Amino acid sequence: ATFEIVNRCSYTVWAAASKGDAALDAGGRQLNSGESWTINVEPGTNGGKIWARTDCYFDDSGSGICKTGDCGGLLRCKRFGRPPTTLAEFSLNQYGKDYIDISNIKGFNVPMDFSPTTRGCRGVRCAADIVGQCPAKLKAPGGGCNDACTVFQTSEYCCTTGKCGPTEYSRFFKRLCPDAFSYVLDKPTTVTCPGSSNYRVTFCPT
């Protein structure tokens, strides 16, 4: 499948794409304001994620640090990024269907639209100013709004027992972005698309 990743933000972001144990395509790239990056994702990929990283510094070897979404200090991510990270999530060619969603389960750093470029399904978006409205205890110094599991590490926020309910903190994310996952057992906002669709991820869509 083809993913076009577009940075419509006024600031530079460093895009990342991984399935947890391996990079997707090159795994990461700098995107200046307005730049687009097209990647190819193998059919059948399960558990892929795309996210943005902010305020990164890398040397010529591709090693460095980012203030949000850092993936072990690499430009080309092999692993998932450190919260807070707005997440575009996808599983492709799962019994004939693609499944896509946006998640705030690992916090929020950059607004995002995740839409198909082929026919047969709708897109999803979380573009509210979650960082500006972020509750005081969830504000990340480096930027962004952490999820409550990352901050407090309780069984209820992290849903460790498989049983958990919504919380004051999850409800904040859900109020501003109803179409993104706000906690592990949230009512699914997953979108079902035809198998082998193509997609565009836009940062700062508005």
Characterization of this structure:
The chain is mainly beta and 206 residues long. It has a single domain (1-206), classed as Thaumatin, CATH 2.60.110.10. It has helices spanning 130-133, 148-152, 155-158, 168-176; strands spanning 2-7, 13-18, 23-31, 36-40, 48-58, 64-68, 87-94, 97-103, 112-116, 124-126, 180-181, 191-194, 199-203. The strands form 2 sheets. Strands 2, 3, 5, 6, 7, 8, 11 and 12 form an 8-stranded mixed β-sheet that branches. The longest helix has 9 residues, at 168-176. It is globular and about 40 Å long. The protein starts with a strand and ends with a strand. The PDB classes it as plant protein. Keywords: multilayer multicrystal VMXi, plant protein. The assembly is monomeric. The entry is titled "Multicrystal dataset of thaumatin collected using a multilayer monochromator".
Say how many strands there are. 13
The second-level CATH architecture is Sandwich
Distance between the termini: 25 Å
Shape descriptor reads globular
β-strand percent reads 35-45%
The structure class reads: mainly beta
Assign a percent range to the helix content: 10-25%
**Rounded Rg:** 16 Å
What is the CATH superfamily classification?
Answer: Thaumatin
Compute the number of helices.
Answer: 4
| Secondary-structure element order, N to C | EEEEEEEEEEHHHHEEE
Largest sheet: 8 strands, mixed
CATH topology: Thaumatin
Pfam families: Thaumatin
Protein name: Thaumatin I
Keywords: Cytoplasmic vesicle, Disulfide bond, Signal, Taste-modifying protein
Family: Belongs to the thaumatin family.
